[PDB]
Design a protein around this ligand. Structure first.
Ligand SMILES: [Cl-]
Ligand SMILES: [Cl-]
Ligand SMILES: [Cl-]
Ligand SMILES: [Cl-]
Ligand SMILES: [Cl-]
Ligand SMILES: [Cl-]
Ligand SMILES: [Cl-]
Ligand SMILES: [Cl-]
Ligand SMILES: [Cl-]
Ligand SMILES: [Cl-]
Ligand SMILES: [Cl-]
Ligand SMILES: [Cl-]
Ligand SMILES: [Cl-]
Ligand SMILES: [Cl-]
Ligand SMILES: [Cl-]
Ligand SMILES: [Cl-]
Ligand SMILES: [Cl-]
Ligand SMILES: [Cl-]
Ligand SMILES: [Cl-]
Ligand SMILES: [Cl-]
Ligand SMILES: [Cl-]
Ligand SMILES: [Cl-]
Ligand SMILES: [Cl-]
Ligand SMILES: [Cl-]
Ligand SMILES: [Cl-]
Ligand SMILES: [Cl-]
Ligand SMILES: [Cl-]
Ligand SMILES: [Cl-]
Ligand SMILES: [Cl-]
Ligand SMILES: [Cl-]
Ligand SMILES: [Cl-]
Ligand SMILES: [Cl-]
Ligand SMILES: [Cl-]
Ligand SMILES: [Cl-]
Ligand SMILES: [Cl-]
Ligand SMILES: [Cl-]
Ligand SMILES: [Cl-]
Ligand SMILES: [Cl-]
Ligand SMILES: [Cl-]
Ligand SMILES: [Cl-]
Ligand SMILES: [Cl-]
Ligand SMILES: [Cl-]
Ligand SMILES: [Cl-]
Ligand SMILES: [Cl-]
Ligand SMILES: [Mg+2]
Ligand SMILES: [Mg+2]
Ligand SMILES: [Mg+2]
Ligand SMILES: [Mg+2]
Ligand SMILES: [Mg+2]
Ligand SMILES: [Mg+2]
Ligand SMILES: [Mg+2]
Ligand SMILES: [Mg+2]
Ligand SMILES: [Mg+2]
Ligand SMILES: [Mg+2]
Ligand SMILES: [Mg+2]
Ligand SMILES: [Mg+2]
Ligand SMILES: [Mg+2]
Ligand SMILES: [Mg+2]
Ligand SMILES: [Mg+2]
Ligand SMILES: [Mg+2]
Ligand SMILES: [Mg+2]
Ligand SMILES: [Mg+2]
Ligand SMILES: [Mg+2]
Ligand SMILES: [Mg+2]
Ligand SMILES: [Mg+2]
Ligand SMILES: [Mg+2]
Ligand SMILES: [Mg+2]
Ligand SMILES: [Mg+2]
Ligand SMILES: [Mg+2]
Ligand SMILES: [Mg+2]
Ligand SMILES: [Mg+2]
Ligand SMILES: [Mg+2]
Ligand SMILES: [Mg+2]
Ligand SMILES: [Mg+2]
Ligand SMILES: [Mg+2]
Lengths: 174, 174, 174, 174
């Protein structure tokens, strides 16, 4: 047993390793979306950069879990990072719909980990999730929902001009 | 009778309290519009902020009436602030049409109060309305009319792309 | 169902709308106190400004709830904002006693909402209340209790000189 | 007839000369109050300076009327400036009560001149009174009423300590 370990359940330790993997999985999916929108036959560079940034965010959140694991005296155990579900992402609407879904999947895993931490009476883990993850999750979900509403408004997937305008106005220029 | 009171008719005092209520009512309606355009299924954030600003303006104008009442030695009497007429505002065109109408309602109440002040030979109240309210009222009515003309030009309510472009170009970015 | 909605109970959504109304109610009561202390026959201007500031604070907290509702995919539903319980507030001691009571009422509604969020296993709503509301609530209650103790010490309600001195020394000069 | 004169009734011209005299009369009364509170057996120097400032304000308002008379092509006609009604002013409460009364007298003369200007269809004179005189009049009346309320609260005329504190806290230190 680690000399630092206190009030840290084995189940929580394991679930933290699974969360770490899920963040790396999410980061990798966003990297795929970045590469797709960088294609010469897609060429929506502000959209591409948006997904690149989110890939870097999820990677940082994985790192955060590693650091957390060690602070509590748990042990980081890594698994394969599965490739994304798709090799190509259709268009900005399809990608944002996938992103929404991915953020909700990540959010459900966070909420599940909070339930577990609650069951094991671990308020440090509960606070950590609340402060570092749950708030920013809800904000990302809201942002992407807002985007999907605007892409629909702009006539996606049929309206190319709408897709062009989204890339100029809705995501920051890169 | 207040020690400061001079040339201040009871009828004017009462009409000032009713104006105060109407400004609070207007502020509350604009707050509703703000919340509507902030919805994830509406998501026109520059439009939302425009209405938020106007809500704050009307609230400040209510405060102004309170201060005025006390300066003249009248007594502030508050009533319920009625909820807005609608819970949802359709789209940017419908909301701006409602806003036009609300500003004209407020303007008519100001003009009615000016008539009353004129009938009661109260030049201080007349000047106050002229300087602090009537000018800025006409400017807000003109601005919103200009907006409605542009929203029609942009193909509202059917043309989503037009609605998207209005939010980017016609109202200041937030 | 909103595309962003996740782990957000209908009961919580409704209780958030009721909290929003209660914050607007509180803001309106403080506005009344502001107008009272601005009267020429009361004329305690630093006290008046204290209540004005608290009115603006509660309004900002209402806005916050609106934004929260939308972030979670709930829907803002507004009701009438009831006028304050009194038209006149007696003196600084009576007003601060009313304010104490109002802050405790608001605090109980926050605590009740935290219980509900806890029952519905909503840690995002729990954290939100904890971070944005509960701490600052306890501080406002303490401040007002401190004031009431000093007003009693100063001989309120009989001792006018004490009331004058409170306005100069206990609340910031405006 | 002056080459500049247009739409300027003889009655208005004369009433402007009487207003000029009344402003000089007011200025002189405030000068008396200044000298009273500067006495070694009164010695309330911040109160004294308050009245000195108001004496200078009323003098500037007299000058303003002179300039106005000439701008319209009327002719300045001066009369004796009557000495103040009292040689000694009792205490801060009595003086502020006299000041309230003097400001209301000046305000009634302004309102009477506005009625006359209205009867003679002189909108330039009406605007002049509205912009340069009537607003600031209401503010001075409110300020002095506020003071009288605080002096009563402080136990004037019996409570010397209250009178001392008013001079330190309610009027700006000189
Ligand atoms: Cl180990
Ligand atoms: Cl342990
Ligand atoms: Cl423990
Ligand atoms: Cl342990
Ligand atoms: Cl264990
Ligand atoms: Cl694929
Ligand atoms: Cl997913
Ligand atoms: Cl967070
Ligand atoms: Cl958006
Ligand atoms: Cl289309
Ligand atoms: Cl957008
Ligand atoms: Cl009264
Ligand atoms: Cl009168
Ligand atoms: Cl009159
Ligand atoms: Cl009156
Ligand atoms: Cl009356
Ligand atoms: Cl509706
Ligand atoms: Cl209306
Ligand atoms: Cl104006
Ligand atoms: Cl325009
Ligand atoms: Cl069209
Ligand atoms: Cl425009
Ligand atoms: Cl909905
Ligand atoms: Cl859910
Ligand atoms: Cl859940
Ligand atoms: Cl849900
Ligand atoms: Cl539900
Ligand atoms: Cl009452
Ligand atoms: Cl209460
Ligand atoms: Cl807080
Ligand atoms: Cl204190
Ligand atoms: Cl006492
Ligand atoms: Cl204190
Ligand atoms: Cl001549
Ligand atoms: Cl003429
Ligand atoms: Cl003419
Ligand atoms: Cl003439
Ligand atoms: Cl004539
Ligand atoms: Cl005398
Ligand atoms: Cl007089
Ligand atoms: Cl003025
Ligand atoms: Cl005062
Ligand atoms: Cl006393
Ligand atoms: Cl004072
Ligand atoms: Mg060891
Ligand atoms: Mg284990
Ligand atoms: Mg595989
Ligand atoms: Mg619990
Ligand atoms: Mg907790
Ligand atoms: Mg984020
Ligand atoms: Mg996220
Ligand atoms: Mg996240
Ligand atoms: Mg454009
Ligand atoms: Mg009285
Ligand atoms: Mg009345
Ligand atoms: Mg109703
Ligand atoms: Mg006029
Ligand atoms: Mg305006
Ligand atoms: Mg307006
Ligand atoms: Mg207006
Ligand atoms: Mg939907
Ligand atoms: Mg429901
Ligand atoms: Mg009622
Ligand atoms: Mg926290
Ligand atoms: Mg606070
Ligand atoms: Mg509070
Ligand atoms: Mg609070
Ligand atoms: Mg000539
Ligand atoms: Mg003549
Ligand atoms: Mg004589
Ligand atoms: Mg005018
Ligand atoms: Mg003045
Ligand atoms: Mg004056
Ligand atoms: Mg004056
Ligand atoms: Mg001091």
């Amino acid at each position: 047993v680690s000399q630092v370990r206190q009030n840290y359940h084995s189940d929580c330790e394991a679930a933290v390793n699974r969360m770490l993997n899920l963040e790396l999985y999410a980061s990798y999916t966003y990297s795929s979306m970045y590469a797709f929108f960088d294609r010469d036959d897609v060429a929506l560079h502000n959209v591409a950069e948006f997904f690149k940034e989110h890939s870097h965010e999820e990677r940082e959140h994985a790192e955060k879990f590693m650091k957390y694991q060690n602070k509590r005296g748990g042990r980081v155990v890594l698994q394969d990072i599965k490739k994304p579900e798709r090799d190509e992402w259709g268009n900005t609407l399809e990608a944002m719909q996938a992103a929404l879904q991915l953020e909700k999947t990540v959010n459900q895993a966070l909420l599940d980990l909070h339930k577990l931490a609650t069951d094991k009476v671990d308020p440090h883990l509960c606070d950590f999730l609340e402060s570092e993850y749950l708030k920013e999750q809800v904000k990302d979900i809201k942002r992407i929902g807002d985007f999907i509403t605007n892409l629909k408004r702009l006539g996606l997937p049929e309206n190319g001009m709408g897709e062009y305008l989204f890339d100029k106005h809705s995501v920051k220029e890169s």
